[PDB]
Amino acid sequence: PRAPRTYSKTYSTPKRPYESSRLDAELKLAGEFGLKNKKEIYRISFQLSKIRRAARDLLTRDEKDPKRLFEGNALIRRLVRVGVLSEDKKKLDYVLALKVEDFLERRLQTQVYKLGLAKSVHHARVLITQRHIAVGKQIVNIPSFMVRLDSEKHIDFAPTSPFGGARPGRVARRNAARKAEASG
Amino acid sequence: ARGPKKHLKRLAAPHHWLLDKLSGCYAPRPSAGPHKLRESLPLIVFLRNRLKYALNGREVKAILMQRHVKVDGKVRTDTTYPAGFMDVITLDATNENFRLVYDVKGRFAVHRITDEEASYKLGKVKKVQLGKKGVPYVVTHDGRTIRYPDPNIKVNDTVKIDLASGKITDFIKFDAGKLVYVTGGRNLGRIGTIVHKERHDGGFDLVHIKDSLDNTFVTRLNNVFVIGEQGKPYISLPKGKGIKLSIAEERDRRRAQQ
Amino acid sequence: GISRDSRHKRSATGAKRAQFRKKRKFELGRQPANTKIGAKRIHSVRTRGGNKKYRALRIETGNFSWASEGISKKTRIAGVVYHPSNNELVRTNTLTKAAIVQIDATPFRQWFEAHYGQTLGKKSKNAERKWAARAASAKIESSVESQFSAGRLYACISSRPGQSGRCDGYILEGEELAFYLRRLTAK
RNA sequence: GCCCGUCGCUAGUACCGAUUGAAUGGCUUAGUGAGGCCUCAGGAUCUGCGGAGAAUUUGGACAAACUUGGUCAUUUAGAGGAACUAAAAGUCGUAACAAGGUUUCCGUAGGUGAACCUGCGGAAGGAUCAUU
RNA sequence: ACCCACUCGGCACCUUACGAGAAAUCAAAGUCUUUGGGUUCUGGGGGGAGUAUGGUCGCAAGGCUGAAACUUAAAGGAAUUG
RNA sequence: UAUCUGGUUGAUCCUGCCAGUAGUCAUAUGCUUGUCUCAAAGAUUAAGCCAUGCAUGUCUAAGUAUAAGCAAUUUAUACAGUGAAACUGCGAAUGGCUCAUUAAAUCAGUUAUCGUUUAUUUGAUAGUUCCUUUACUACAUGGUAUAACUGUGGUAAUUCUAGAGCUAAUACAUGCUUAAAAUUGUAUUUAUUAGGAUGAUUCAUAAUAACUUUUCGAAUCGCAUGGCCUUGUGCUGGCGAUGGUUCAUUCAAAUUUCUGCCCUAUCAACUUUCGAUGGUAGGAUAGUGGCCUACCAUGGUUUCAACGGGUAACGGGGAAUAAGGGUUCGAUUCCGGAGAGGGAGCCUGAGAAACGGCUACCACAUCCAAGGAAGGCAGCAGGCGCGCAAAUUACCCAAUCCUAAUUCAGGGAGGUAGUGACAAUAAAUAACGAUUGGAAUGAGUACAAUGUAAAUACCUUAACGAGGAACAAUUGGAGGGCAAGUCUGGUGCCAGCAGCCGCGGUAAUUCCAGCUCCAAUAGCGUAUAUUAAAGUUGUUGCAGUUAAAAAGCUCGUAGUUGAACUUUGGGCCCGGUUACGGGGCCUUUUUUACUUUGAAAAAAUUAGAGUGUUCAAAGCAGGCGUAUUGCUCGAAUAUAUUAGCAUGGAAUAAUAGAAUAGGACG
RNA sequence: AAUAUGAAAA
RNA sequence: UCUUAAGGUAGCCAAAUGCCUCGUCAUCUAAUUAGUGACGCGCAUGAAUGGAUUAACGAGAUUCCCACUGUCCCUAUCUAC
């Protein structure tokens, strides 16, 4: 038959599931970033742990080692392109120094909120998932859309979205029709 | 398995064919021909996926049947003809002309040539015998047999064969200095010059090959193909001229030509 | 069918091998031809690859070569007299390889007389000159000297009648002829 | 305080157990031995001194399969017998833990409703590190 | 035969504890998470059980090898205070 | 991301296990269930049984067509186009499924064929076909059938077919046109002779004497019909297809070298009657070979674990989980095996021990009009049975390929759809305002288009489609590990809960309910197995006085281990890197183990590079244009242990040397 | 010199 | 508690010894008062008035099985005297 379709898990649930400090910290993160489930923080922490394992295995290698240079520059380049890392902290040890807050802050939810198109982070997620926010010039409804370093400048309302200057949605149309019928 | 196998699956296909792993169960199994099932490029993969001329196998078959396509000097109509290493494929209706050749990554390149060079091809003479009636003959890597060769032509040399008629235009010997094409092994596609051979008894022979940038490597003699003089190839080589720079160097070149 | 595989024979360490696969055609054997003498009867057996093998039986005559002379003549077969493998083949007159056989002597005798102009036991000018050039060729050894008087020649069968269909052979001579004669007369 | 064993009830597990016990599978001696194949023949019929050739048929090799024994492996019934385990409050004693009221334990042998008792030798894990 | 000193080899002993150990205690039970001088045997919670069985030795008593089903959350070791 | 925690006690320190915790492309099951992508799926027990219907057929210009077929000789009087039926040639030996049998067997890496067969493809290759040696030959070219058909029929019945009359071949059985150049083809076999390549050959090839029941060396087909005249149905002449011997090539096949496999001594000796190890010879093979046979010697394996037994054992690539070591699993998408209910035999064919091919027996099982006949779903669906355990008797050749005479036909191979909480990706169940309101949206419909073979869904989108009793999120839990109730009602060691410790006997933070709260959340729990934790399997890295454990003691073979010593130190330079490492010289100058480097080690998988599939799982796509021109980056990179191959070194550890000197030189 | 036993949970 | 000199111990059994008895259970068979293995409050087993077991042996007694057959179903024929 057909060659198997490879797949992988994007998170890893933690051992000792029941640490009070861990629960409080993750609920703090969820409350102040609008995350729907602990699965989102688990995925973010798993990506962080994977890139940190890669960074540690990279730092273990001797300096100017060809593999070390290639993989390190690739990793920091993708980190700065995503925007989780910053240009000034271009060294490799800052990858280790990274925290989950950077990845949670480079999300489309919080970036929409920072840009100011939303009243709250939850309002931002609602707007994102109702196909109202559009990166570049295309509608996207991914709250976890990792915005590139050249996309926050072009984050704005969708051309099709009623808040983006298009036809004023459905509820507004219904109420306008009702008002016109009453006034007729 | 109580007979010959007449099927090939995508995973079992050679990697340099570059078939995707998810479009279809099977791979185009090459029919019998001048070259082995591996290290050979079928015309269906040379048209549908290499040149993108036809979108489906049926359209590849239509192209083949209307006789636009001829490998070497003869027209080919089978859907999966095993065009090998130095085979010249014409496509006269579009006036292009390619010669198959390995890029430095280790895959069949799409290197185009002119007709003034397509009028010939080279072949690494793989065996020399005396056929019937005492007549000597040579057989090259594409099964092609030429009778009455020059007595100086021995195994591991290269013979230039005119596509109009099988005849020895000239030959290139196997000795130190000759530019060679590494066709086989980890150095698939690499090009360099020979400094010396090893010539072990019984075991596989070894040759030490250094290139223009003085990157010495070693390869079995069964995977080399001498193609011309010292820095004077008898054929036109694809882009890169058979030099493999490191991964970092490739990335730098890509970003500089971005 | 007779199986040629070693999967049925006991292992070198006495281990009874287990039945792995059913018998296969590419390892099949066939019964011996057991070629007798008289009234040639060769049956054609098809063999793998579409080839043909001549399973001979009851062969009449064979081509026998006198290696010292270099010539070979068709000759009728008197019969086997000694077989290195089995005496049953000798007893039942079976034609197989390396069989020591008696054959007719007249063709070789006539060839010798017409090529060297001599005789065993007991005319043109070109013929006399040819015999003078080939002089001292009647020095043929005493074995065959008395052989031709006996009228039958001892020859070793060098073909495989069960394979090629022919019973070609070569005349015993010298040391090997003496050895085989000694084996015959060992009593 | 703790605790031991016999006995009494209930339940479960396994073992021995007459039954020349019973099944399933593997290998195999021996007997019978289909079948196609090779071969010695037989030559209906058809065809131009010949050729092809069906039924049948001689021997040989391959050898299914059946039967009787042999062996190995995996399960499994069985009257009855003797154990073990478990389960809040059953009977008989008090054997051990204190010098447990005869110090205990080990081996061995005998005795006995039951723990256990006694003989011989050994140990202190003894109740003595000690009599110039 | 003594005395004194020294030495080799023994049964040991006294004091410490560098060190070890859970502790009782240990010149070995030390040179062990700073983990490797050589090697033999043995154990994997308590039972069931050194039982059944199959071997094997024994005149016998029994010895050597020696399970499994099943059952249980303790069994045990050393010290403390009562 | 090299971590633990609750439980023996009045309390302590240990051994020690129980229990908790987390993962599982690991299964089942319970409850609950909106969306997108992706997708496993009758393996476990029964390789158990199977109703039914499909899965292998196939033609061009180019084998045979007077179908009493179609359409026409507007090209033609032998035919001319198409074309059912049928002969002919190929294929049906591929694919698909399953994992029963298999423990040096398969299989993996690595070797060999100087040890052989090989349809097809590719490339070469038959003056000797007058050779039986110039009409065997008719060579402007040969012979007979026989299919297809009409008619007569038998049988209840089958993909049964008999008798009669027709007729072709690239079907069968024959047979020339080859002059003649030299010195008589090729094919088979025998014996003799010479002998460009390999590390090496009796190799390749060539020359002799022949043998052969005799192979092959074109009586085939479609197009184009052209040049020469001494103009004749004359002589020459193109493009092909098909066929053909030998050699090579390719697709392969069969054997083959070394190394490597789980548990078992409550399997220690096994093989060897009648094959066991080996030799000689012959048959047999496609070929080597005790593969088989005859004669002969008595050998071969084994405590470095043979032989035997079990395997809930197809092997591997790989999967889960892991600081390092490792443990467990691998029926299953790829490779190689083996099977078609068991077992054997065999035809055809290059290729089969073939089962969607036959033959027989066994076991099943079907229709009979009671004489007969026909089968193997471990293919596709599907049914029964077995079970804890696994989907529709659907559509299509549109992709990927495959086959055939072959662009066109066929393909339950394959794809699409249906079932599908196996698993993975993303992510709705609500946001804002003022102290009750507007604004948005997707679920769910649906004109339309895209999508597709046609469709369903997805992407888009007219219109419809939120205000709660709505469009309502569950699964487990609240004494501790393990955060979360010292709240209420009911029960009263009963019901019951409880992974463990334990709770409950009229004041239950523990049972059944309510409220509240908590963890995870379209998922959660339960059971089993396995991994980490486990330094409780301990090579790294356990313990043995008392916790379990040092055999009663000693001897001793196998095994493991085993005192030191043999070349050092020193000068002079060269060339690398920023002293650090190499090299050369002078100073009197036999086998291994090991170890560096390299070749070689299928993909898929793993790590990883690039790339906004709307992100992500994924995938290997894509990107940039003046977009009517078009151009262009890619699809890397590393492993790979053991085993084998070459190679640098001579420390470490074995191994022999010259002691009744037959010892070196010379 | 005789002295045996004291239920189940907490 | 009565009583004896002691109160059948080890063992074994419906045994050739068990009246009731064709004891009860199992196995053997279609069916078994038979056979065998068990159970033993044994009228009335039992220790050199020897107990139990026992390889081999037996013109001893008994049960079953295979082979075998005119023992029988069911009789018939032949020969000698």
Choose among C43, C6, C12: nearest CA to C161: C43
In a shared domain, residues B184 and B91: no
In a shared domain, residues B75 and B148: no
Both structure tokens of A49: 């742990």
In a shared domain, residues B69 and B112: yes
Choose among A3, A136, C32: nearest CA to B24: A3
In a shared domain, residues B142 and B104: no
The SS3 assignment for C130 reads helix
B71-77: long-range contacts, CB 8 A cutoff, minimum separation 24:
B71/B43, B72/B121, B72/B163, B73/B163, B73/B164, B76/B43
Three-point CA angle B114, B193, B180, nearest 5°:
45
Residue B253 lies in a domain: no
Chain B contact set for A71 (CB, 8 A)? none
Q: Residues A171, A174, A180, A183: is their CA dihedral positive or negative?
A: negative
Q: Residues C56, C181, C136, C122: is their CA dihedral positive or negative?
A: negative
In a shared domain, residues B138 and B82: no
Phi then psi dihedrals of residue A54, to 5 deg:
-60, -45
Q: How far apart are CA A126 and CA A103, in angstroms?
A: 20
Choose among B158, B180, B178: nearest CA to B229: B178
In a shared domain, residues B106 and B5: yes
Resolution (A): 3.1
Residue B249 lies in a domain: no
Residue B125 lies in a domain: yes
In a shared domain, residues B87 and B188: no
Both structure tokens of B228: 């011309």
The SS3 assignment for B5 reads coil
Region of residue B12 (left: phi > 0; alpha: psi -120 to 50; beta: else) = alpha
**Chains near C (3 or more Cβ pairs under 8 Å):** none
In a shared domain, residues B85 and B23: yes
In a shared domain, residues B106 and B3: yes
Please name every residue paired with B171 in a beta bridge, in sequence order, or none if there are none. B159
Candidates B10, B22, B248; nearest CB to A70: B248
Q: How far apart are CA B12 and CA B37, in angstroms?
A: 11
Candidates A3, A66, A70; nearest CB to B11: A3
For chain A, say whether B164 makes contact (Cβ under 8 Å). no
User: How close B45 gets to chain A, by Cα (Å)?
Assistant: 19
Q: Are strands B224-229 and B232-233 parallel, antiparallel or unpaired?
A: antiparallel
For chain A, say whether B258 makes contact (Cβ under 8 Å). no
Q: How far apart are CA B207 and CA B218, in angstroms?
A: 6
Residue B153 domain boundaries: 121-171
Region of residue C154 (left: phi > 0; alpha: psi -120 to 50; beta: else) = beta
Q: Which nucleotide is nearest to C39 (CA to C1')?
A: F213
Q: Which residues contact B193 (CB under 8 A, 6 or more apart)?
A: B177, B178, B179, B180, B209, B210, B211, B230, B231
10 Å CB burial of residue B213 (0-12, 13-18, 19+) is exposed
Chain A contact set for B246 (CB, 8 A)? 66
Candidates B10, B248, B251; nearest CB to A3: B10
Both structure tokens of A20: 């009070």
Residue B256 lies in a domain: no
Q: How far apart are CA B39 and CA B17, in angstroms?
A: 9
10 Å CB burial of residue A132 (0-12, 13-18, 19+) is buried
For chain B, say whether A2 makes contact (Cβ under 8 Å). yes
* Technique used by the depositors: cryo-EM
Please name every residue paired with C51 in a beta bridge, in sequence order, or none if there are none. C47
Q: How far apart are CA C3 and CA C26, in angstroms?
A: 9
In a shared domain, residues B101 and B1: yes
Q: Count how many domains chain B has.
A: 3
The per-residue DSSP string of A115-135 comes to HTSSSSHHHHHHHHHTT-EEE
Residue B258 lies in a domain: no
Residues of chain B (87-106) having a beta carbon less than 7 angstroms from strand F: 105-106
User: How close B21 gets to chain A, by Cα (Å)?
Assistant: 6
For chain B, say whether A64 makes contact (Cβ under 8 Å). no
Distance from CA(B228) to C1'(D95), angstroms, rounded: 107
Q: How many CA atoms lie within 13 A of C123 on its CB side?
A: 0
| Residue A150 contacts strand F, CB under 7 A | yes
Q: Which residue of A has its CA nearest to B247?
A: A70
In a shared domain, residues B73 and B140: no
Residue B132 lies in a domain: yes
Choose among A37, A70, A31, A32: nearest CA to A54: A70
The answer to whether chain B touches chain A by having 3 or more C-beta pairs less than 8 angstroms apart is: yes
In a shared domain, residues B151 and B125: yes
